[PDB]
Symmetry: C5
């Protein structure tokens, strides 16, 4: 039953241990679904956004036989390993608006979907034009290079109809960063939010 699955996850899950299988990186899939654009400052080039960060990976150490059991449970993220994802151009801490629970599937797949409100330093020039602003948000692992975490990406279906802004396009492009000190490459997703003020002349 659910209590047994959660008891077993709590005994075997190592929240502090990246679940690398053999020498393979953990494949972290990351998509933003934009829900709202709250505050835009064309002078300071800062945006306040709310997005669903759809995050999935496989931790095969969590797997169980579900032929005669539930094949999914909700688990507090404090009981699981979670990727140390960070937005490189964030200027506030991510504010998680929703309960900090992941779904764990019996094959060991983990789904985490926090609703995040966060402020970014990005190109706001053009927000009050027809072609709009393009704000680029770079999200990757802060401490795990490409041999440990790989980042995989997967338009306004969930965007508030009541925002003063409308979304023209969202592009999600794989990319990587390297710091001259070390040979290590860190994978990121570059998310390009092309948006503008509604109801211009």
């Amino acid at each position: 039953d659910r209590a047994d699955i959660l008891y077993n996850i709590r005994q075997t899950s190592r929240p502090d241990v990246i679940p690398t299988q053999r020498d393979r990186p953990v494949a972290v899939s990351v998509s933003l679904k934009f829900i709202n654009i709250l505050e835009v400052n064309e002078i300071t080039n800062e945006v306040d956004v709310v997005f669903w960060q759809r995050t999935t990976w496989s931790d095969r150490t969590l797997a169980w036989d579900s032929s005669h059991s539930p094949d999914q449970v909700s688990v507090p993220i404090s009981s699981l390993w979670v990727p140390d994802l960070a937005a490189y151009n964030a200027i506030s801490k991510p504010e998680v608006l929703t309960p900090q629970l992941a779904r764990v599937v019996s094959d060991g797949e983990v789904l985490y979907v926090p609703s995040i409100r966060q402020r970014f330093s990005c190109d706001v020039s053009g927000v009050d034009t027809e072609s709009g602003a393009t704000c680029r948000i770079k999200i990757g692992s802060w401490t795990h290079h490409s041999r440990e975490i790989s980042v995989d990406p997967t338009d306004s279906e969930y965007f508030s109809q009541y925002s003063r802004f409308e979304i023209l396009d969202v592009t999600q492009k794989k990319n990587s960063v390297t710091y001259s000190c070390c040979p290590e490459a860190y994978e990121d997703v570059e998310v390009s939010l092309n948006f503008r003020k509604k109801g211009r002349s």
Copy 2:
């Protein structure tokens, strides 16, 4: 059995991280908002700042005790209990719980949690400064539990509403509804709360 024994027993049996589903039946969560205050409304950004009592009740039959010779209710910290992972889909701020985070547990295993919440929402503020007012829709449901695991059930709309708000309540309707994501067949149940209000 005295209060200390009831709380000792809850601490031994309660599994805060385990939904109390009885066989494969969903946990029936009842959710009502009582609006207490409307603090800030922005017609331009379509954002409201409200204070509401979220009356939340469910059954966790693993907590039940014989109360023929004991108290039939205790106050328990929610950190000792399983609580539904309810979230407002159109919230744009964290829920600010203004009150002590205690539930009442009844000897039949019923749990009552009534946080006073201050939160900001993105919703329709058009018409707020007119006679017929705005209608702001607040969608609250389980974030991670689909309809087979949690079912959400709604139940004098300004009985507790501050007479000192700049706004007044015309009507509150509470309608059952559900959300579904393209990927998956799973339905997540919500209550849609329709707050019809206006400037005084």
Copy 3:
């Protein structure tokens, strides 16, 4: 018994999650506000930001010790004691506790907690800029314990900042109760009436 022994014994006997009801009786919680400052008033939104000392006392007789040859009082962190779940019904912010979260426990089992609280209320600010002033009513009771489990008992500008832009005309503290349609249970509150004005 020295201070370390009194604190060791409180830590063994205190159940922070268990209301200390003696022989089925409600716990008698005594609550007074002493207003220290009025920081921001908004006559348009009807909101006030205040600083007050919330003098709170009750009896937990399970904590009592023989003090004929011992200290008759210690300071204890409130995380080691049961504390009443008091809330202000018309608060629009969390209480911001400005002071160390310590109670005094007396050898007879009396507990004194006096947090300095900064909090915002929704209340009547009309008249603040007149001679007779505004009357802001702050309703404080137990959130979860009805009258058979907690009773709230009350007891003006002696400690009010001389440097506030406002001054206090009168504070009245009256017992009252709330009851919900659903249930016969009554929840006790103190209504505190702060009559103040701009200087």
Copy 4:
């Protein structure tokens, strides 16, 4: 004895929740403010936002060790030590501690805590824009410990040259408060910050 042994001894003997009174004698807490910055002043609301180093020292002789062949000081998290429950009576914000919450424990049992605090006060800002300046009084004492348990014992060397304000004088005077109910006296330091706009 290495640092880990000194800290393991402190950790096993220190009772964070127990005031270290020797027999019936109060703990002598020494408190000085060193003003670092005056950030915001409001002559209408009479409110000041200040940054100060709160130099705090007392003795816990039960922690002492022989340091003839050992370090004579360690840094210890304050959560492992008893710390005086000091509060500013005219504070209108919670103290924002800007620095790591570590004390120094010296081998004779002296404890030194020097948090950098940013806090807002309700105090006399009248005269700030004049040559003789404002005098803002900050009362700091034990919140819960009367004079038989804690006694409190008391200018621009470190004041930011980039403040809009400058310090004319800091006075630190011992004082005490008493509540009508009870015979108990609570000791405080009154700190008088005489300052003005430059």
Copy 5:
């Protein structure tokens, strides 16, 4: 040894509250700021709000393992590790850490911590609106560990192109503070940010 074994061993051996001094030598802390953004500048109050990457490295040799047949690096929560008690002497807000609080531990016992910090400083903003710009000096050192216990050593590539400011020059110079009372010297890095409005 796999990752789980190395992290289990670090968790068993780490002493978060014990400075890892090797022999009687100070711990060599290396500190560089990489400026990412300048958010708010106030030429009247002389206050700046900045975002920087604080590159911090030191050695804790007790954490070391044989990595000839193992991963030579893991990510560890800083709450499991000793971390230098670094503070900015002219900060006027708490450091706001924007990134996951994880360090890298290398098999030789080297620890790398790179928090992204947003913090407000009191410093010289005069000249920000001119061609030669302002020079804002940020002093960062150990708050509680003198020069015999911690030594601090320094060494627009990542600066946002979308700031309304631009960086002309960053200087990182070793320095020290001493308090008249005591012979103890506290080592700091003085970081000189020369910047201007675009």
